[PDB]
Amino acid sequence: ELEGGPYSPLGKDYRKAEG
Amino acid sequence: YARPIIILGPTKDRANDDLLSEFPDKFGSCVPHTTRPKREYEIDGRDYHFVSSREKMEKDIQAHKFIEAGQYNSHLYGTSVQSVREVAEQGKHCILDVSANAVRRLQAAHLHPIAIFIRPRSLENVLEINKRITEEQARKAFDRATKLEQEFTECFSAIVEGDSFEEIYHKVKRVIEDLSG
Description:
B: 181 residues, globular, Disks large homolog 4 (chain B), Microtubule-associated protein 1A (chain A), peptide binding protein, binding-induced folding
């Protein structure tokens, strides 16, 4: 339930979350 | 003291990157919070502020300590008013990728964000301004932009448009300095 990026609350893990 | 920045609409990610790459002294990002376990070489207060209790987080949440927060991989993540605050206190514009929701929550903290909306003129116009995507990616982006505007128009500090990203980027920079004072 989160789609975000480096400057999101996802921080470092934004990338892993794009799969 | 420096007002945080929330850029919304198509190409906001490139805008976000370029401002950082071009004016690193004037712009930066805050440290987010997470419940999930500190990894091997990871650092508390650099990579994240790690919170041990999934409840302590939820306690901090409803207390309004976070401008946005949410769930990933059955762990929690959030951007604290505080982490943002320390960026701003430093004389740096804090680059935010957040829902327009966070803007209200941000205003409420007497943090006065500059919320800029990049407005696509049409579908074609999205394709002029972002040359790395397909028609179909562009349709989706043009639609996200229409809801966004339909919903949050009044939360905007400014609305920018252009026939190229160059032109948009220029307006974005203009707006920021102008509203910075």
